[PDB]
Design an enzyme around this catalytic site. Sequence first.
Site, mmCIF file in Angstrom:
data_model
loop_
_atom_site.group_PDB
_atom_site.id
_atom_site.type_symbol
_atom_site.label_atom_id
_atom_site.label_comp_id
_atom_site.label_asym_id
_atom_site.label_seq_id
_atom_site.Cartn_x
_atom_site.Cartn_y
_atom_site.Cartn_z
ATOM 1 N N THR D 91 0.824 -1.246 0.000
ATOM 2 C CA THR D 91 0.000 0.000 0.000
ATOM 3 C C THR D 91 0.847 1.281 0.000
ATOM 4 O O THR D 91 0.355 2.289 -0.530
ATOM 5 C CB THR D 91 -0.982 -0.003 1.178
ATOM 6 O OG1 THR D 91 -0.234 -0.036 2.395
ATOM 7 C CG2 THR D 91 -1.938 -1.174 1.136
ATOM 8 N N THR D 92 2.031 1.269 0.615
ATOM 9 C CA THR D 92 2.902 2.442 0.617
ATOM 10 C C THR D 92 3.667 2.619 -0.687
ATOM 11 O O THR D 92 3.845 3.754 -1.154
ATOM 12 C CB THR D 92 3.903 2.364 1.772
ATOM 13 O OG1 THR D 92 4.658 1.152 1.666
ATOM 14 C CG2 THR D 92 3.184 2.386 3.104
#
Lengths: 44, 529, 89, 521
Positions: D91-92
């Site tokens: 997700t990052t």
Amino acid sequence: LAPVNIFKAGADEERAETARLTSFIGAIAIGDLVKSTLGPKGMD
Amino acid sequence: ALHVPKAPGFAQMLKEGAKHFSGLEEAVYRNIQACKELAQTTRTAYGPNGMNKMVINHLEKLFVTNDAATILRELEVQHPAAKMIVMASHMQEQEVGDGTNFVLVFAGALLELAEELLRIGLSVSEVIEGYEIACRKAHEILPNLVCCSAKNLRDIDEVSSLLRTSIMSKQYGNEVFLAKLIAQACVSIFPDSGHFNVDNIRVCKILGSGISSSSVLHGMVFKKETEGDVTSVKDAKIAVYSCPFDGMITETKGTVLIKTAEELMNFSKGEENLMDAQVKAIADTGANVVVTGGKVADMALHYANKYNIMLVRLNSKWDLRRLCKTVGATALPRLTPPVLEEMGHCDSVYLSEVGDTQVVVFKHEKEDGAISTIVLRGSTDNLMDDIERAVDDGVNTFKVLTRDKRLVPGGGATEIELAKQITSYGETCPGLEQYAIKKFAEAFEAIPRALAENSGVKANEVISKLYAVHQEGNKNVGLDIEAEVPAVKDMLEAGILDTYLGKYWAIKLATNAAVTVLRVDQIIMAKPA
Amino acid sequence: EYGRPFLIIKDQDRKSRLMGLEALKSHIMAAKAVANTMRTSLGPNGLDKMMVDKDGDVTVTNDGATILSMMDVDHQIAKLMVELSKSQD
Amino acid sequence: TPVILLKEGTDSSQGIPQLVSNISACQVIAEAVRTTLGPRGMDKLIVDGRGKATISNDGATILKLLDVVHPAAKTLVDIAKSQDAEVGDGTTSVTLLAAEFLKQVKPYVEEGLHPQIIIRAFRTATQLAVNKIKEIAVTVKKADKVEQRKLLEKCAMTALSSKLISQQKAFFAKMVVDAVMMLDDLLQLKMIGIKKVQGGALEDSQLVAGVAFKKTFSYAGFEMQPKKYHNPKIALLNVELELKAEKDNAEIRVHTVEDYQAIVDAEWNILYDKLEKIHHSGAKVVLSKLPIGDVATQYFADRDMFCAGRVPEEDLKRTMMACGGSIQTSVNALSADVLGRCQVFEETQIGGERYNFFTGCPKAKTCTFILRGGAEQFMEETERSLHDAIMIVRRAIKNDSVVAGGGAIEMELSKYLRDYSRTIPGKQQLLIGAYAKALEIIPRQLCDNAGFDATNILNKLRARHAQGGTWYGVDINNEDIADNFEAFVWEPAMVRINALTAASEAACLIVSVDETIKNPR
Ligand SMILES: Nc1ncnc2c1ncn2[C@@H]1O[C@H](COP(=O)(O)OP(=O)(O)O)[C@@H](O)[C@H]1O
Ligand SMILES: Nc1ncnc2c1ncn2[C@@H]1O[C@H](COP(=O)(O)OP(=O)(O)O)[C@@H](O)[C@H]1O
Ligand SMILES: Nc1ncnc2c1ncn2[C@@H]1O[C@H](COP(=O)(O)OP(=O)(O)O)[C@@H](O)[C@H]1O
Ligand SMILES: [Mg+2]
Ligand SMILES: [Mg+2]
């Protein structure tokens, strides 16, 4: 007191000397209030 | 100092907060300004090179699109003239479904050109008659430019090649893939009879992978969950019910009355036996899956699980009808074992998971079926909505092609030809309407001018080259987008076509809106509430 | 382009933030304060605390878990120490 | 001026300035989760309006907790949510990649370049990168039944390296692999239970192949019945066992006291008939979703049988799947085939709570986690860390293609795109070069978080990757570079395939916006 706050607004803390002073003052006041009604010649 | 008190009569009898505008200087010249500004607002979203626009409505909802109708719907307009132009655009969208920006551009150009005629001396009536004559002449001229009519509306490649353009005008780069998908979906459900219902194409959006992972499915999908233990059927006979899947009761108030103890000990056993008998009677016909539109009971679910019956509950009152159309069953308003004619047939019925979404799928192998569904996969709800709008425009274009088979060249060629021929006609008309006719002819250059400006070239050179090449008898030459130098290209060979009916209706509605705006003389507004 | 104050976060002008070693130092100070308060009640010679309730009720106790439960704090680190004591209990 | 077009309060902004503003806002959004990447990444603490705190290292969770209202910034939250829903990890990285793309193409936008050229270059680069990844991925056709387990274990251990439970990754990977391999063919997530009981140490966490759930409300007499069985039979019901009115629609009209007495006796007769029907089937444990009365509890306790009521639906379904019975709404057909069987049942004290354990069933298609810890947020972060490994293992079971991590794949893609760019002329060369340069933000951020000299390490990585070492990345402990494929730093190819497509799609959408219009209120 530490620069960081560890309490909600209105919460209070008393440490050794202040706590002993407060407790002793309260107890002595309570005793002195009721001392007068002791014995065969007490008053109302 | 002193004050100018008021004028006697209406100026004194007017209510507080009301507005009264009259004359050319206070009504017409302001309405023209409002319409011109409204047209300029959406001018920049026209053509393949149009730029997207971001609008937030009064409920803090986010829209990203370059569709003129959506932009005008999400904006809120306070000026009556722009309101009438907006209603003209909405009527065009309802009637055809594509060409909502052409109307705005044409109306704005017509009004801004009539302003200078009014300035130089002509009155409103002479402008109106000239516009009407020019519009009739344009409608007469238009058929002669028809070229490359549609041949077969049941050939996948031909349908894709006909639908490519209207999608390419919104999704530059994905037009081939989108055209292939929409062509498959449309050809799937097209009956022997010409009747083609737009409502028979469903769109389902699942968050997940990229657009290239979209697909088309010959059946139905619902974002629901199976209510029973059974999860998959390999050859499904379907029963459909509109009533709740429970033992029915009286419409009038009822009460169970008991005077002995045997009735008290026997009531629940009798009820359970009755429910079991009904469920087994339903199951004996061979039904594998029961679809209901209302509440299910615990005892009914227990017996359905006992007899290996798949139970699906969907509830829209329209999804039920669509499923009935898809499978070939008739909804039963009472809980009774179905007759064969009332029994639907579907090949595969199952529960699946796609990108953190549980779905129930009714799937066929038939290439025709009754309806079809398009499953879109995107990384953003706004992107999926934009792709949905593009799919809607493609479907509308297919329906219009079903209605009428004729095509005309695009990319400015038709507008240039119409302008040239209308100018030639208006040269020979003696009177004061020749100026209005020439202005009507000149208003047609706004479309190629907007295309060139959005592309990022010099519009004057493009228009001059278009005129020069059209003077030699080349009627299928239009603007080139790929080149970095202003150039021209043959549109018939390149396959940039558009429908005849859309152009017809767009010209008609734009002219009507322009003359209606021009006819107003004075305006009375009450105070807003 | 003049990147004037542009709004990213709701209620942007009334929220605070702390990053880097300053946050770690603040956490350490809060933990030290709690531990120093709890130090004196350890051993057979330790003393006890008097806690006054919200309604004025009095509790004299030596139990660390009860003391930390009856104290009301704002610091998230202090709440973490309270939860640590409760989990041990 | 006398009558205005739009309503008062409308705000509009167009041209290069608003595009530059969007690029600027995306930078802040990426800065919000910058320092949470890699084995030496920290975590963040967020406090909401009600004073409830959340401690998290998950990019999607952090972005959701932030209250972002910028229309251009919301796209970076949307792509993070999409990645979390699709693959469950990464997700990052996608947010960092999107912000890097925008920052790299900012100056060309400032020079007046037409955005559609940039969009075309991005699409070409994304297609090329995805094709190259799919070409150079590593797979084993027919490896083994045991070489199909070390792959999953390595993937899980790599997924758990940057989380709070990093020290016990070898302990947790085995449990997650077992949990996934004990799970059906649809791999439903609801068939895995997660329980959090305060007290104890992390190494006290356990996995029960069976089922276990918290004690429910009990009436008088519950303490008078046994609490351990060896070979019991289990009845699962959806029936309410207590003295009550037959139907709320009912009414009784009677004339004589004898019939009154018979009516009174009838209800007890009905309840006792149900209880005897349950008893005569041989079942020793009874579970229900509906209340179990005190009369029923004392009846069961007087015959050495265990009863539990108000059991949650999810727990009852999991118990049924573990044991092999079926939920019954009627006790009139209690045959053997509808009774569940387990090899031992107990009730135990765990950290101040009482738990019911069914263990020993070999045909189980489920399992349950019991997680220990010192705080509510400690356990919540443990659960969040476990979810990341679970999803990764599920995807790896689906397809078993892996690539090395630590920046090796990004370096290889950057080298490939840089080599490709030199072939084509024009501004496409510059844009493809910018795209290739934007890919090495991940190793740079890894080194920045670890506290290295990122420039020298990047130079060494570039020099190694060109000389011919496809799988070379940064070594956190050794302060240098190392072959990450022989060091067992693995991840499925989907994480990078989905990250590139998602990041490229968000970059194109933001660039292709011309003006923003805001309506009142
Ligand atoms: N490849 C192309 N080259 C040149 N012009 C095109 C091309 N595709 C579409 N157009 C033109 O774009 C014009 C407007 O389409 P669009 O921008 O979708 O708005 P609308 O169709 O709503 O008027 C059409 O008149 C068509 O001629
Ligand atoms: N008689 C004793 N002599 C020496 N140390 C003691 C004695 N009694 C208790 N302690 C110590 O006092 C410490 C604190 O215990 P206590 O004050 O009861 O609170 P807690 O047990 O919660 O820490 C214990 O670690 C124990 O070793
Ligand atoms: N043992 C390791 N050595 C070097 N790099 C690692 C190691 N474990 C993970 N990484 C890197 O950390 C990154 C993963 O970041 P993380 O913070 O776990 O969440 P996300 O996967 O969402 O970025 C991957 O790019 C991977 O290359
Ligand atoms: Mg169109
Ligand atoms: Mg990660």
